[PDB]
C-alpha cells in the first residue's frame, strides 16, 4: 500500500471545508489538510494499536478506537 495519502481527494477536502463554512479554499490547503489528517490518524490508530495489542487481539475493534479518542479529549458517541 503506497500513495494512499492521496485518497483524501481535493473535492473531499473541499467538501469538508464546506461543512465548516469556509468561503474559499486555497490550492495549498489540500496538501496541508492531508498532512494534518495524516498526523491525527497516526496518533489515534497508534493508540488503538496499543489497545488492540493489550487485548491479545489482531483486529482493531470500534471500542478501542473510542478509548483512543476518549483519552485525548475527543470522545466519540455512537460506537
Amino acid at each position: 500500500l503506497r500513495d494512499n495519502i492521496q485518497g483524501i481527494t481535493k473535492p473531499a477536502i473541499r467538501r469538508l471545508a464546506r461543512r465548516g463554512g469556509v468561503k474559499r479554499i486555497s490550492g495549498l490547503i489540500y496538501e496541508e489538510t492531508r498532512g494534518v489528517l495524516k498526523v491525527f490518524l497516526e496518533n489515534v490508530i497508534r493508540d488503538a494499536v496499543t489497545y488492540t495489542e493489550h487485548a491479545k487481539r489482531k483486529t482493531v475493534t470500534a471500542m478501542d478506537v473510542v478509548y483512543a479518542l476518549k483519552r485525548q479529549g475527543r470522545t466519540l458517541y455512537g460506537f
Binding site: 500500500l1 503506497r2 494512499n4 495519502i5 485518497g7 483524501i8 481527494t9 473531499a12 467538501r15 469538508l16 471545508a17 464546506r18 461543512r19 465548516g20 463554512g21 469556509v22 468561503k23 474559499r24 479554499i25 486555497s26 495549498l28 490547503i29 496538501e31 496541508e32 489538510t33 494534518v36 489528517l37 495524516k38 491525527f40 490518524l41 497516526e42 489515534v44 490508530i45 497508534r46 494499536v49 488492540t52 495489542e53 489482531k58 483486529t59 482493531v60 475493534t61 470500534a62 478501542d64 478506537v65 473510542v66 479518542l69 475527543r74 466519540l76 455512537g78 460506537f79
Partner: protein, 98 residues
C-alpha cells in the same frame, strides 16, 4: 445565447448550506479505509480493522477536520480575508496546542 456563469462564492455558500444541514459522510469509504491500513502497517503488520471500527475513525476525523476548518475559517475573517491559507491551519493547531 449566454451561459449562466455563476460568480465565485455563491455556489460555495450554496454548498455550505447544503452540507451543513446534511449528515452524509463526505469522505469516501475505501479511500479512507486504504489510508488507515497504510498508516497502521507502519506500526504493526498483518493488522485488520472492523467495518464499524473504520466508521468510528471516519466520523471522528471528519468532525475534527471540520472543527479545525471552522477555526481556520474564523482566522481568515480575523485576518480580513475570505480565503483560507496553509498558515491559517498552522496557527489553528498551535493555539489548540496540537
Amino acid at each position: 445565447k449566454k451561459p449562466h456563469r455563476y460568480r465565485p462564492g455563491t455556489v460555495a455558500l450554496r454548498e455550505i448550506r447544503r452540507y451543513q444541514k446534511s449528515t452524509e459522510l463526505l469522505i469516501r469509504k475505501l479511500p479512507f479505509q486504504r489510508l488507515v491500513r497504510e498508516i497502521a502497517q507502519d506500526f504493526k503488520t498483518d493488522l485488520r480493522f472492523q467495518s464499524s471500527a473504520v466508521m468510528a475513525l471516519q466520523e471522528a476525523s471528519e468532525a475534527y477536520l471540520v472543527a479545525l476548518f471552522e477555526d481556520t475559517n474564523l482566522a481568515a475573517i480575523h485576518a480580513k480575508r475570505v480565503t483560507i491559507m496553509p498558515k491559517d491551519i498552522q496557527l489553528a493547531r498551535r493555539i489548540r496546542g496540537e
